[PDB]
Amino acid sequence: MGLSDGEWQLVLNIWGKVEADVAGHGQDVLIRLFKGHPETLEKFDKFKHLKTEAEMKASEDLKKHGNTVLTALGGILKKKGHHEAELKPLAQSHATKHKIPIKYLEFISDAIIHVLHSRHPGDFGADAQGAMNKALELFRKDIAAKYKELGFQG
Ligand code: HEM
């Protein structure tokens, strides 16, 4: 499931573009996630009134969440697979406190890739697409294993 050094370089180069506007990218990720998979939105009582894309884009609170999520994921990606320390608290909260179904991590991975195509079509070529897919697959695989270790089957 690992990535080569070259693959990690493609991942971190496109992530570098995300880092120019972490909150905005993160907002767009959550908009894609919530619109495409409304069951995910249901996990956020505070966002229940957000129905349209425009309403979601207008929400500074959703933007803050976008920043939270992509800040943590960026920290994980920069470790190039050596992310035990970063993954531990995230698995613990999402498995045992928030109880977020493991499938939703696939949905958010898809959403990240959608946003990268949307914002960076010139710089997100097929090699970067493949490498980013591998990186998100590794993250998902590792956090799914932790979910089970923690006793969360959802
Ligand atoms: C790339 C995947 C994700 C990352 C990096 C991520 C990151 C985080 C971080 C850093 C926090 C705050 C600290 C904590 O409680 O752990 C958090 C809180 C939370 N996350 Fe996630 N998250 C991810 C995916 C999801 C998904 C897919 C959902 C639900 C659909 C979700 C639901 C929550 C909820 C309900 C909270 C508590 C919200 C609050 O009370 O403010 N997360 N997330």
Author numbering: 0 to 153
From the manuscript:
Hemoglobin (Hb) and myoglobin (Mb) are the key molecules in animal aerobic exercise, as they are responsible for molecular oxygen (O2) transport in the bloodstream and its storage in the skeletal muscle, respectively. In the present study, we investigated the molecular evolution of whale Mb by experimentally resurrecting ancient proteins. The analyses of their chemical properties and structures demonstrated how Mb molecules evolved to adapt ancient whales to deep-sea environments. The atomic structures of the synthesized aMbWp, aMbWb’, aMbWb, and swMb were determined by X-ray crystallography to 2.4, 1.6, 1.4, and 0.8 Å resolutions, respectively.
The aMbWb and aMbWb’ proteins are the common ancestors of the toothed (Odontoceti) and baleen (Mysticeti) whales, which would be closely related to the early whale Basilosaurus27. Two residues, G1V and G15A, are different between aMbWb (polyphyly ancestor) and aMbWb’ (monophyly ancestor). In aMbWb’, these residues are identical to those of aMbWp. Thus, under the currently dominating monophyly hypothesis, aMbWb’ is positioned between aMbWp and aMbWb, and therefore regarded as a pseudo-ancestor in this study. From aMbWp to aMbWb’, V13I filled a cavity in the hydrophobic core, T34K added a hydrogen bond, and K118R (interacting with another substitution, E27D) introduced an electrostatic interaction on the molecular surface. Although the side chains of G1V and G15A from aMbWb’ to aMbWb did not appear to be interacting with other residues, their introduction might increase the rigidity of the main chain conformation. The consistent results between experimental and theoretical evaluations indicated that the observed solubility should be an intrinsic property of the Mb molecules determined by their structures. ΔGsolv increased during the evolution from aMbWp to aMbWb, whereas it minimally changed during the evolution from aMbWb to swMb, indicating that the single-molecule solubility in an aqueous solution rather decreased during the evolution. However, the resistance to the precipitant (β) significantly increased during the evolution from aMbWp to aMbWb’, slightly increased from aMbWb’ to aMbWb, and remained almost unchanged from aMbWb to swMb. The analyses also revealed that the adaptation via the ZMb-increase strategy reached a plateau at the last common ancestor of whales (aMbWb’ or aMbWb).
